[PDB]
Amino acid sequence: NNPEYSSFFGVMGASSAMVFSAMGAAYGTAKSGTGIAAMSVMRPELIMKSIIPVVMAGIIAIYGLVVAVLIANSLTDGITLYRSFLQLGAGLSVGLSGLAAGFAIGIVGDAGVRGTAQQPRLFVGMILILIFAEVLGLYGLIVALILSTK
Amino acid sequence: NNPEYSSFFGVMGASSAMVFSAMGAAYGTAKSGTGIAAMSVMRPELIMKSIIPVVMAGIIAIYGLVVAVLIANSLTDGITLYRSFLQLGAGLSVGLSGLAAGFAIGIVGDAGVRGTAQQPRLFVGMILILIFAEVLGLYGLIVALILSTK
């Protein structure tokens, strides 16, 4: 009744939502760590004032994980084409959104880490920018959970 | 009756509404953060003063989310090609208008923060140009609605 290649699109989503999300994290924790390397010298006691971007990167990684797992949990052999397209679209959208969010968090973290190093009062304000990048992560998740059922 | 390929295109449109627009917003935020760094050390009192560009980036994200939800509710198994291509066109147009507006706001925000770092009177001026960026996004969104009817 339905072709076997219908599986294609579906599980590709179950891959992509993970893959790209991880790439984003690989930029969030890395470049921020490079910034903390410079921060460590002038004032080594502000590591707790600079551990934010890495936790953000971990959060976006968790987002990718949960969408990928949920989409994978709805797998079956006789899946309809419609469902397959739905899963692929959701997975790709969340993956690329996670990638973009990771890029933004990494860049702003590297800037703000040394910015706080030179200027203490920047610190609180720095957090503000990070939160907005994190919001993009939320938004990706939303679409997937709007595409899982409907 | 209708082909089975038909469900593909429409779903893909939704993905664009949560990829491209989002990506533009991301760039904007990142660039603005760099500006804040260059301005944080010398004129520390105006950190919160420069909350205005970053939110003006996040709004682009908001727009994407709106259209995405809509195209997650008009999707049904029995879709003709006409509807599918209407929806694909809407998604493409809104995503690209978001992207272009994001690039514009990012550059203008860098220039604005740097200019205000040396001239308070420039403040209002920068705000003016920033509006002309954000409105561009709205134009994309407009046709999306026009493509949910015709």
């Binding site: - | 003063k49 609605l145 026009i146 949910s148 009817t149 015709k150």
Partner: protein, 246 residues
């Protein structure tokens, strides 16, 4: 000519033209009243936030555009995404719909939407209270709303622009410069009028004249405008708007 007395009232009106929502009007008005009522206290106080200073400088504009936002939202009939229904709808009563050969079609309708063609012969009725509320759940509200906004925006813009351009003649006579009025503003105004007042009259004509029963064969205004712009004169495919058009 100082443009203060015009702007002081045309700015809240335009903001209301782009702020068609009533609950948010109430919220902004409450904000404005809060700022205003503490005039003596705040002016005799030490403040630091620059946003607060600019907002306190613009309290007058904020209050006026909140008050206008309230009214424009009321005529919009969109208060917090819903329609304030005064319950004067006159659209569908059961035995009238069954009189028009329609009974127990909801059974197949449990999965489809079933637009109703208008004019069964027993319905109509405009609404004095702004916009009729039933649109707020109609799944085709977008089309009529967008048509209405298109025509709204164009018409208001043309009139406001005419108001803008009509003032220069005063100063021209005032400065006593005959060459800049006889061969000046006159061609400008005749050109603008002959181009766009035509669009205004045509759009009102289409609104008022073409009844529902003539839905087919009804014309498209933009096609007519483009046709006259290009001087093309097809003999078929679009009917003349009114006698003596050519």
């Amino acid at each position: 000519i100082n443009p203060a007395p015009y702007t002081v009232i045309t700015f809240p009106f335009l903001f209301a033209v782009m702020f068609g929502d009533f609950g948010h009007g109430i919220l902004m008005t409450l904000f404005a009243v809060w700022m205003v009522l503490r005039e003596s206290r705040i002016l005799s106080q030490k403040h630091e936030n620059e946003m607060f200073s600019m907002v306190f400088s613009g309290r007058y504009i904020i209050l006026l555009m909140g008050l206008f936002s309230i009214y424009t939202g009321l005529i919009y009939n969109d208060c917090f995404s819903k329609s304030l229904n005064i319950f004067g709808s006159s659209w569908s009563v059961r035995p009238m719909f069954t009189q028009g050969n329609w009974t127990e079609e909801t059974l197949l309708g449990s999965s489809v939407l079933q637009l109703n063609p208008a004019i069964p012969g027993v319905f109509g009725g405009p609404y004095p209270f702004g916009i009729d509320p039933i649109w707020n759940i109609a799944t085709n509200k977008l089309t009529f709303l967008n048509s209405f906004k298109m025509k709204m925006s164009v018409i208001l813009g043309i009139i406001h622009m005419l108001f803008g351009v009509s003032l220069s003649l005063f100063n021209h006579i005032y400065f006593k410069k005959p060459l800049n009025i006889y061969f000046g503003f006159i061609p400008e105004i005749i050109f603008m009028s002959s181009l766009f007042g035509y669009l205004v009259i045509l759009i009102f004509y289409k609104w008022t004249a073409y009844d529902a029963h003539s839905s087919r064969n009804a014309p498209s205004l933009l096609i007519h405008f483009i046709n006259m712009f290009l001087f093309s004169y097809p003999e078929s495919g679009n009917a003349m708007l009114y006698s003596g058009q050519k």
